[PDB]
């Protein structure tokens, strides 16, 4: 699994620069590959899985300890039942060998998360995923996120439903809805946003993958077919990320400064409105506006922390 002479060498050279902490993959091209190698479609998806395993060894060797992969889209439920069942049994086959290979998970501290609208999967596939996810919680050496029956819109809209659920239960006031609150309700709320997003084959589209989370991720479209993915593709991807890093860091940084600035700007407006309605003057040495602003944010942080605490509790799917 360890890298060769050249791979070890180039790794050492880029590791001297900014490395990505989190890489996201759209493993695309499995069927086209199968047509080139004249193997059935299922063998292309099997070979596609082998590559997902190898490239994780590459990231683990490069220090990239968080990886998100697009494994099955809700849109893919429109394929042939032959193809789809073929995919479903492949997921059954691999999620089963994961428990046969337990303890090795405990040895390497590999945490497995499966994100998406998993209620659409076969009940047995759900039970397998659940056992795998639960058995691997409290592991922190490295993290794999597997997006199964996922689209970003379904994740984003679910993230707003959980916040409306909080509104509905008294946990949350609609003025509390914020960008970061939505961030903490996505399936990926445990991970940081990907530094890089990688889509294989010639496609220059995102196909409903982490649209929210990759708004400032560095986008890499490589023409290679996913079953053909080599270390140097992954390398070139990182190479592109380092070249964009300065630009993306400040763009990312100044997006956050502007939103915080606007947050305050929008916040102090209402505190002005409340004082104007109360008639209590805008600014004063008693620093009422100053003190009433610390009250607004503190009472908001309290409600949000209380909202999140319950969500993660409800997110406990011991049965699942």
């Amino acid at each position: 699994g360890e890298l060769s002479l050249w791979e070890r060498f180039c790794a050492n050279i880029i590791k001297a620069g900014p490395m990505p902490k989190h890489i996201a993959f759209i493993m695309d091209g499995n069927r086209r590959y199968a047509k080139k190698c004249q193997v059935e479609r299922q063998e292309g998806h099997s070979q596609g899985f082998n590559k997902l395993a190898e490239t994780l060894r590459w990231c683990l060797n490069l220090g990239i300890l968080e990886v998100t992969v697009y494994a099955f889209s809700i849109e893919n439920f429109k394929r042939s039942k032959s193809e789809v069942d073929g995919l479903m049994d492949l997921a059954r086959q691999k999620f089963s060998r994961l428990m046969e290979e337990k303890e090795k998970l405990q040895k390497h501290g590999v945490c497995i998360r499966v994100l998406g609208d998993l209620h659409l999967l076969p009940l047995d596939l759900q039970e397998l995923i659940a056992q795998a996810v639960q058995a691997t919680k409290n592991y922190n050496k490295c993290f794999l996120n597997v997006c199964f029956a996922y689209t970003s819109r379904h994740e984003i809209s679910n993230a707003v439903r959980e916040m409306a659920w909080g509104v509905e239960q008294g946990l949350l006031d609609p003025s509390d809805i914020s960008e970061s609150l939505l961030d903490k309700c996505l399936y990926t709320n445990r991970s940081p946003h990907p530094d890089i997003l990688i889509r294989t084959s010639g496609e220059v589209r995102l196909s409903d993958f982490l649209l929210w989370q990759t708004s400032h991720s560095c986008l890499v479209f490589q023409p290679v077919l996913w079953p053909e993915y080599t270390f140097w593709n992954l390398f070139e991807a990182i190479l592109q990320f380092q070249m964009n890093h300065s630009v993306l860091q400040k763009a990312r940084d100044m997006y956050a400064e502007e939103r915080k600035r606007q947050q305050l700007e929008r916040d102090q407006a209402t505190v002005t409105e409340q004082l104007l309605r109360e008639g209590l003057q805008a600014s004063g040495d008693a620093q009422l506006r100053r003190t009433r602003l610390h009250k607004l944010s503190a009472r908001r942080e309290e409600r949000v922390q209380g909202f999140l605490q319950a969500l993660e509790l409800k997110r406990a799917d011991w049965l699942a």
Binding site: S152, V160, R161, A164, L206, S207, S215, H216, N244, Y255
Partner: protein, 182 residues
């Protein structure tokens, strides 16, 4: 005049974007992008959104319209900002959660379809094709909800963009195969 020329150009491509987005990552030159937008109208693209992460075009909006009408002498345009993306998604959230608070809508009643009906783009199609100009390999916050299937074609600069350069990009999009998950 030369309008029929550009009509037959756009009409000749296997596919033409219904909604096109222009992402400028690079000060931006109003004369240049004001002529990218009139090209889209001439070839037959219905909607053009222009975007930038620093919000330069949204501030200097009217100044961009003046350059657009000026170059229309050589012859449905939104100027977006990061506000148009995540901020608008978080706006629709607050609009829906208060319907849930009014006991009018249920939290379970929001789906992918209804949330789309709730965004500011409720009066436009999603962008079919995005032209990204500049060195940045990121969307930089362009309409994250809406770019789920958009084709993203990059060009190194809008610095002195030629018609051939712009039209070479439309040829790439015309040749793109959208499988839509099937």
């Amino acid at each position: 005049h030369h309008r029929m020329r550009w009509r037959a150009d756009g009409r000749s491509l296997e596919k033409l974007p219904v909604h096109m987005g222009l992402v400028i990552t690079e000060e931006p030159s109003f004369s240049d992008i004001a002529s990218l937008v009139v090209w889209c109208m001439a070839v037959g693209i219905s909607y053009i959104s222009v975007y930038d992460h620093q919000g330069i075009f949204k501030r200097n909006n009217s100044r961009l319209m003046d350059e657009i009408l000026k170059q229309q002498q050589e012859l449905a345009v939104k100027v977006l900002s990061p506000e148009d993306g995540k901020a608008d998604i978080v706006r629709a959230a607050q609009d829906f959660c208060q319907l849930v608070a009014q006991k009018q809508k249920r939290p379970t009643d929001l789906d992918v379809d209804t949330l789309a009906s709730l965004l500011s783009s409720n009066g436009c199609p999603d962008p079919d094709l995005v032209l990204k100009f500049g060195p940045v390999d990121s969307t930089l916050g362009f309409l994250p909800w809406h770019i789920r299937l958009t084709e993203i074609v990059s060009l190194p600069s809008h610095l002195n963009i030629s018609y051939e350069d712009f039209f070479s990009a439309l040829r790439q999009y015309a040749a793109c195969e959208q499988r839509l998950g099937k």
